[PDB]
Amino acid sequence: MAVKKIAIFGATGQTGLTTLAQAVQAGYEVTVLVRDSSRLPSEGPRPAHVVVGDVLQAADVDKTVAGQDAVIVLLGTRNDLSPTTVMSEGARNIVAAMKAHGVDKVVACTSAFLLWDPTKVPPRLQAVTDDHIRMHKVLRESGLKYVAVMPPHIGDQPLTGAYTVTLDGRGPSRVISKHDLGHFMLRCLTTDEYDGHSTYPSHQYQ
């Protein structure tokens, strides 16, 4: 087990940007798929490789997944309020490209709403949650080594690295810093302990 090359999908998002920065600082050779390159910061840590394209475009995903050791998925659809399939269709393209290229490890973020009663989901988040569920099923039925990361509210607190991780359930805390969440996405690259499990990271930021 030695992951050196990773693809990150969703690297321009709030969690993606800090996951990308941390990965670069730790020494990973990171490839990102971005739809427009000007949103990547021009100062600080930069990825080794940039593919310009869409997770909905199978060829763009293929170019991104080729030659990787593992994939991190931090896709989201920003403000869709009504039925949407971007994340699950992108997950299908990711799965197909990982198969074609022999990449066997994927760490993907959905939501802790998948661990709660469906009546906890606010009405205007039901569509996105539904597609998270579709994307989770896609990844679980793929047969790939899949770590399901299902975070509660994503905050802006500083990196601590001291969060809780609860397997196949929700945990006591109900927030995770975007920085701590990115930290855990990368921690999942260094072990098979979470493979096949759903994970809930959460921490105290008093």
Ligand X SMILES: O=C(O)c1ccc(-n2nc(-c3ccccc3O)nc2-c2ccccc2O)cc1
Query: Mask of contacts with ligand X, 116-135, x by CB under 6 A?
Result: ---------x--x-------
Instruction: Quickly tell me which residue has 């998925």 as its tokens.
Output: 73
- The answer to whether residue 188 is catalytic is yes
User: Binding to a copy of itself by residue 140, rule CB under 8 A?
Assistant: yes
| Residue 87 to residue 82: CA distance in whole angstroms | 13
User: Binding to ligand X by residue 13, rule CB under 6 A?
Assistant: no
Taking the CA of residue 70 as centre, how many other CA atoms within 13 Å lie in the half-sphere pointing to its CB? Answer: 24
User: Binding to a copy of itself by residue 173, rule CB under 8 A?
Assistant: yes
User: Binding to ligand NAP by residue 74, rule CB under 6 A?
Assistant: yes
| Residue 19 to residue 181: CA distance in whole angstroms | 8
Backbone Cα Rg of the chain = 16
Cβ pair 31, 10 in contact under 8 A: no
Catalytic pick among 30, 188, 189, 200: 188
- The answer to whether residue 109 is catalytic is yes
Binding site residue list for NADP(+): 10, 12-15, 35, 38-39, 54-55, 75-76, 78, 87, 109, 132, 153-154
The residues near 34 (Cβ < 8 Å, ≥ 6 apart) are 11, 12, 40, 50, 51, 52, 53
Supply the minimum distance, in Å, between the C-beta of residue 94 and a copy of itself: 15
Q: By CB under 6 A, name the binding residues for ligand NAP.
A: 10-16, 33, 35, 38-39, 54-56, 74-78, 86-87, 109, 111, 128, 151, 153-154
